[PDB]
Design a protein around this nucleic acid. Structure first.
Ligand SMILES: N=C1c2cccnc2N(O)C(=O)C1C(=O)NCc1ccc(F)cc1F
Ligand SMILES: N=C1c2cccnc2N(O)C(=O)C1C(=O)NCc1ccc(F)cc1F
Ligand SMILES: [Mg+2]
Ligand SMILES: [Mg+2]
Ligand SMILES: [Mg+2]
Ligand SMILES: [Mg+2]
Ligand SMILES: [Zn+2]
Ligand SMILES: [Zn+2]
Lengths: 183, 367, 367, 183
DNA sequence: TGCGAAATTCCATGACA
DNA sequence: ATTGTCATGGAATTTCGCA
DNA sequence: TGCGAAATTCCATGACA
DNA sequence: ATTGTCATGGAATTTCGCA
C-alpha cells in the first residue's frame, strides 16, 4: 500500500458552544491525518453554511482527498455533500455513537480541548484573539511517536517559533477554583 | 590689462600661441584666427561673459561655448564654461542625467519558506462587496501567495489579515515598501511582539519589492481574464486566484509554489504523483534537494555608460512628487556609505541621513 | 478507442513509438515512459483535457503542458496545447506581447521653412494671468518655435493664435496629434480656407509629433530654471523663452533655429558676425547650402526579437484607456495595408478602417 | 561699408485713428529697411504703453539694431528710451516736420495706406480680422528695384502664398461714392 | 612625422501627460 | 489616411601648436 | 554515428500605480 | 539602515526514435 501523505485525509469536528468571543460561539477543528497539523476556524453556529465558509478558506490553500467527520448535521447535509463533490473531495463518516479517527488525531483533538480550556479560564470571552497562538503551539508540539512536529512534517523545515517550554496543560488548583465558580 | 599688455608688444604668454598676431582695435585686444577676428577679453571679464552666455537659455557646454566663440577667444574656454555649469544651481537641479544606473543585483533566494515575506497592496479596485484593496503576501523562497481583501490599505487591516496568516507560521522577516500601512508604529509594535524583523525598501523604488510586485501582475492578469464579459465582481474570485497561482508551474523552475512549500500536491486537478511510492521523510529529503538547486539569475551586463557610487561623491536625489514647472532633482548631497553597488546612504539636503536606491540618484555633473 | 485498440494488441501507429509497451489498467490505456506511467486518453478526450488544464490559471504553453504531463501522454502534446492557446479569447486580449516593435523611422527633415508645422498643447499649468495652457508651434525644417498662452486647449484659441502666426507666412502642412482642438470640423474648415493640409498622427502615439514634443521639454525645462525660488508666474516669461530657444545652438547642427530661418542673427547677445562682408544674396546662397547639408539620423538597428507587419496578418490594437481589471488589447484584426514599416491600416474590431502605429499593436500569438 | 542686412533698421510709425474694429483704433507699422518686410500691430492708442506691448511681441521674434521713427510722443518718451536701452536698440529720430526714411520704405508705407483704405471701404469696422491677409499681400509683393519679394529676402525661399494677381490698389468709381458718403 | 594637450566629434541617456 | 527627437556631458577621436 | 522531428531550453519583452 | 521579478512564445539547442 502507498505511504501516508499530507492532504490524504482531513479530520473535521466542531467544538462548542463556547462563551461568546467577538460574535463567535464554535470552533471548526481541522486536523491533517498524516502530519497532525491543525487549522482552527471560529464560527457562529455548527451549520453547513459556517462549515462551507470556513473550509472555503482552507481549501484555497490546500484541498484534501478525503474529509472525515462524525454524522453531525452540518456534515451529513446534501449541501455539504454537493460542496465536496464539486471539489473532488470524498466524504467519510464514522458510525453513529462510535467516533473513530486515529491515535494521532484522537490525541491531537484531546490536546486542543485541554489547551482551549486552560486558556479560557480567566479570560473566557477573549479566545478569538488567541486562536493564532493556539495553532502555532499545537503545530510546533513535539510528537512522541514520530520524531517531528506537525510544522516539520508539513513544510520540511524547522520553525521560527519552537515551543521548547512545554506547557503543563493541566489546570492549576487556583484555576480550578475560578473555573468552578461560573459554570 | 597686465597679461594682455605684454601680449600686444610681442612677448610669449603660456596659453596664447605665438603663430597668430595679436593687436589692438577700438580699445580692445583682438586676434586673427582661422574662424575670424575674435576679441580677447581680460581675465577679470571672462566669468561675466561665460555667465551672460550661459544665462541666455541655461545651455550646456557646447551650446554655451558656440555663443561665446562668436565674439571672443581665450585659452581653454571650455574649462571656464564647465566651471560655471558646475556652479549654476538651476541647471544642476533641473537638468536630466545622461548616465544610467549600474546593473541590477539579483539577491539570493531566501533559503527556507517563512524566512522572508514580501507584502504589498493592490488598489483601489472597483468596489466589490464593499472592498477596494487586496493585501498580497508572497513567501520569498516558494512564491506561495496569500490574498486578503480590504476596504483600505491600512495598518489595522494589515494586522487583521496577518494574524490570520501567522496562524500557519511566523516569518523571520517581512519586507515591504514605505507605504503608510507598513511604516506606522502600530505595525512595528505588532512585529516586535512576534519576533518579526521589519525590512523596508528604499523609497520610491518598487523594484525592491519585485517579488510581490511581479505576483501582483499575475493576480490582476488572471482576475482580468476570469472577469471578461462580466461585471468586475472580484471578491469571490480571490480564493480561486490564490489557489490557481499557488499551483501554477514556473517554466524555469519546473515546480509550483505549492510544491516548493509542501513537497507534494494536494487534491487539485492534474496533481503530480511522482513521489507516491516514497515515504514522507524520503519526500522531504527530495524537497530539501529541490529547494537548494533552483535556478538563480545573475547580475546582467552594465550598460556602456553607467555609474556606480563612491564614498564622498556628490550626488542628487530625485524629487518624489515634483510640482509643475519645478525641478526634478534635489540639491547636491554626499555619499556617506555604499551599502551595495545599488544602494547608498546620503547626507540629505535637509541634514538627515537617508538610505536610497541609485535609480533615484544622479551623479552631480562637472564635479 | 479505435486507434488505441490496435495499439494495445501490438500494431504500429504513427506518432506512438514502438519501443515502449502500451497496456490496459483500470479501464484506461497506459504507457510506461521514463518519467513514469502515463495515461493515453483517446483522441476525442484530448481537447477537453488541454482546456481543463489551461483554464486552471490560463497558463501559456509550457506551464499548461507541465500540468497535462503529470497524468497524460500522447503524440505531439504541445501542438494541441498551442491550438487551444490560439483559440482562448481571454488570453489573446489580456496577455502581453513579447515581441518589440521594429526600429523607428527617421523621416526626412522638411526641405524648406514653412513646409511643415508641428503643433501641440502644453498643460494644464499653474494659473498665470488666468492662462493654463500653451500652444506650441514648431517649424519642422528650422526648429523655430512660436509660443501662445491660452485658457483652454480649444479650437477657438488655436485659430486665434494661428491667425497671428500666419500673418508672417502660411505653411503647406500642419501636423498635429488627434487632440480635440485639432480634429474638429471648425479647424479643418480654417485650414482649407488657407490652403493648409492638415496631417494627423496615428492615435495615442506622441512619438509622431516628436519634433514639437521635444521642444516642449526644452520650454518646460527653461521655464523651470527661470522660476526657481519664485512663484510660477510663467505668462510673462513665454516671450523670453521663445526668443532664448530660437537663438540657442544645436550642438549637432552648429546653428540656431533663428539662423536656419533667417540666415543671419538679429540684435541678440553674442550675435554671429561671420557673414558681415557678404551681400544678402550671397548670404542667402550660403543659407540654401547650409539647409541642405544638415546632419540627418538613420534608422537604428532592430532589436533581436522585433516584428514587422505583413498584409493579411492577425494583429491586435492596444486599448486606449483600459478600465481596472479589463483587457489591455482589442480582439484580433487584420492588416489591410502597410503604409510604412511602422504604420498600418487595419480592419478594426468594430468594422471601420483605422490607421495605427505598430507601437500600439501586437501580433496575435499562435497564428 | 558693410552691406545692408535684415534687422539692421526697423522703421515704425502709427496709422490712425481708424474706425473702431473689435476695440482697436490704430495700427503700429513696422517695416524692415533692407527687406521691406512689414509687421502690423493693432493698438487702442498711439501711446508708449501700446508701442511697448506690440514691439514686445515682435522683439520676441527678432530684435533690430536700430529703430527709426518720427518725433511722435510715444517714441520720444523716456519710457520708450528705457525700453530700447534695455534691449540694446539704438533709437533714431527724423527732424520734426521733415519725415524721411528710404525710397523702399516710403513706397512701402504708401502701399500700406492705400491697401488699408481700399479694404476699409464697404467694411470699415472689420479691418482687425484682415490684418493677416494684408501683411501676406504686402510681404509677397514683387519689388521693382530688387528682384525679390520681402518674404524671399527675409527667409530665402519662395512663399506658399504668392500674389500673382496684382491688385489694382486704386479705388473704383463705385468705391469712391460709398467712401464719400460717410466721411 | 611625432608628441602632449586642446578642440572637436561621438553618442548613450532620458523626457517631451 | 502615415513616420520620434535632440540637449546633455563624459569618452573617443581628431586637430592644433610646436619641433 | 547520423538523420529528421519532437522535446526541451533559451531569453528578450514587458508590466507589476 | 539595503538589493527586481518572472510568465510568455518564437527561436536556438538538445534529445528522441529509428537505423
Ligand atoms: N508607485 C508604487 C507605489 C507607491 C506607493 C506605495 N506602493 C506602491 N506600489 O506598491 C507600487 O507598486 C508602485 C509602483 O509604481 N509600481 C509599479 C512598478 C514600477 C516599476 C517596477 F520595477 C515595479 C513596479 F511594481
Ligand atoms: N499622452 C499625450 C497626449 C494625449 C492627448 C493629447 N496630447 C498628448 N500629448 O501632446 C502628449 O505629449 C502626450 C504624451 O503622453 N506625451 C509624452 C510622450 C511620451 C512618449 C513620447 F515619445 C513623446 C511624448 F511626448
Ligand atoms: Mg505599495
Ligand atoms: Mg506594488
Ligand atoms: Mg497633445
Ligand atoms: Mg505633447
Ligand atoms: Zn544654468
Ligand atoms: Zn486562456
Amino acid at each position: 500500500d502507498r505511504p501516508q501523505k499530507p492532504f490524504d485525509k482531513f479530520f473535521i469536528d466542531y467544538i462548542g458552544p463556547l462563551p461568546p468571543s467577538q460574535g463567535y460561539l464554535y470552533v471548526l477543528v481541522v486536523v491533517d491525518g498524516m502530519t497532525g497539523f491543525t487549522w482552527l476556524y471560529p464560527t457562529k453556529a455548527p451549520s453547513t453554511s459556517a462549515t462551507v465558509k470556513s473550509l472555503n478558506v482552507l481549501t484555497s490553500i490546500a484541498i484534501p482527498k478525503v474529509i472525515h467527520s462524525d454524522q453531525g448535521a452540518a456534515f451529513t447535509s446534501s449541501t455539504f455533500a454537493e460542496w465536496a463533490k464539486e471539489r473532488g473531495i470524498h466524504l467519510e463518516f464514522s458510525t453513529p455513537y462510535h467516533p473513530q479517527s486515529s491515535g494521532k488525531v484522537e490525541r491531537k483533538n484531546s490536546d486542543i480541548k485541554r489547551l482551549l480550556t486552560k486558556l479560557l479560564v480567566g479570560r473566557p470571552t477573549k479566545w478569538y484573539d488567541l486562536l493564532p497562538v493556539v495553532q502555532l503551539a499545537l503545530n510546533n508540539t513535539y510528537s512522541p511517536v514520530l520524531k517531528y512536529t506537525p510544522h516539520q512534517l508539513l513544510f520540511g523545515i524547522d520553525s521560527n517559533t519552537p515551543f521548547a517550554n512545554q506547557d503543563t496543560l493541566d489546570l492549576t488548583r487556583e484555576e480550578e477554583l475560578s473555573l468552578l465558580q461560573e459554570i | 590689462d597686465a597679461e594682455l599688455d605684454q601680449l600686444l608688444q610681442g612677448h610669449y604668454i603660456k596659453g596664447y600661441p605665438k603663430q597668430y598676431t595679436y593687436f589692438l582695435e577700438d580699445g580692445k585686444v583682438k586676434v586673427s584666427r582661422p574662424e575670424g577676428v575674435k576679441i580677447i577679453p581680460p581675465q577679470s571679464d571672462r566669468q561675466k561673459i561665460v555667465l551672460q552666455a550661459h544665462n541666455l537659455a541655461h545651455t550646456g557646454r557646447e551650446a554655451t561655448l558656440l555663443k561665446i566663440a562668436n565674439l571672443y577667444w581665450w585659452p581653454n574656454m571650455r574649462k571656464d564654461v564647465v566651471k560655471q555649469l558646475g556652479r549654476c544651481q538651476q541647471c544642476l537641479i533641473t537638468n536630466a542625467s545622461n548616465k544610467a544606473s549600474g546593473p541590477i543585483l539579483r539577491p539570493d533566494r531566501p533559503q527556507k519558506p517563512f524566512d522572508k515575506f514580501f507584502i504589498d497592496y493592490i488598489g483601489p479596485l472597483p468596489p466589490s462587496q464593499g472592498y477596494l484593496y487586496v493585501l498580497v503576501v508572497v513567501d520569498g523562497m516558494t512564491g506561495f501567495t496569500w490574498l486578503y481583501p480590504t476596504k483600505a490599505p491600512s495598518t489595522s487591516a494589515t494586522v487583521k489579515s496577518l494574524n490570520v496568516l501567522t496562524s500557519i507560521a511566523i516569518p523571520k522577516v517581512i519586507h515591504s515598501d514605505q507605504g503608510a500601512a507598513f511604516t506606522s508604529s502600530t505595525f512595528a509594535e505588532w512585529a516586535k511582539e512576534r519576533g518579526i524583523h521589519l525590512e523596508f525598501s528604499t523609497p520610491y523604488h518598487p523594484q525592491s519589492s519585485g517579488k510581490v510586485e511581479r505576483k501582483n501582475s499575475d493576480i490582476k492578469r488572471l482576475l482580468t481574464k476570469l472577469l471578461v464579459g462580466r461585471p468586475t465582481k472580484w471578491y469571490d474570485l480571490l480564493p480561486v486566484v490564490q489557489l490557481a497561482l499557488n499551483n501554477t508551474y514556473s517554466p524555469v523552475l519546473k515546480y509550483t509554489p505549492h510544491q516548493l512549500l509542501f513537497g507534494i500536491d494536494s487534491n487539485t486537478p492534474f496533481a503530480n504523483q511522482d513521489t507516491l511510492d516514497l515515504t514522507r521523510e524520503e519526500e522531504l529529503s527530495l524537497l530539501q534537494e529541490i529547494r537548494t538547486s533552483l535556478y538563480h539569475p545573475s547580475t546582467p551586463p552594465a550598460s556602456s555608460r553607467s555609474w556606480s557610487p563612491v564614498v564622498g561623491q556628490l550626488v542628487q536625489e530625485r524629487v518624489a512628487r515634483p510640482a509643475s514647472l519645478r525641478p526634478r532633482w534635489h540639491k547636491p548631497s554626499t555619499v556617506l556609505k555604499v551599502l551595495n553597488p545599488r544602494t547608498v546612504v546620503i547626507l540629505d539636503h535637509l541634514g538627515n541621513n537617508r538610505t536610497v536606491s541609485i535609480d533615484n540618484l544622479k551623479p552631480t555633473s562637472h564635479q
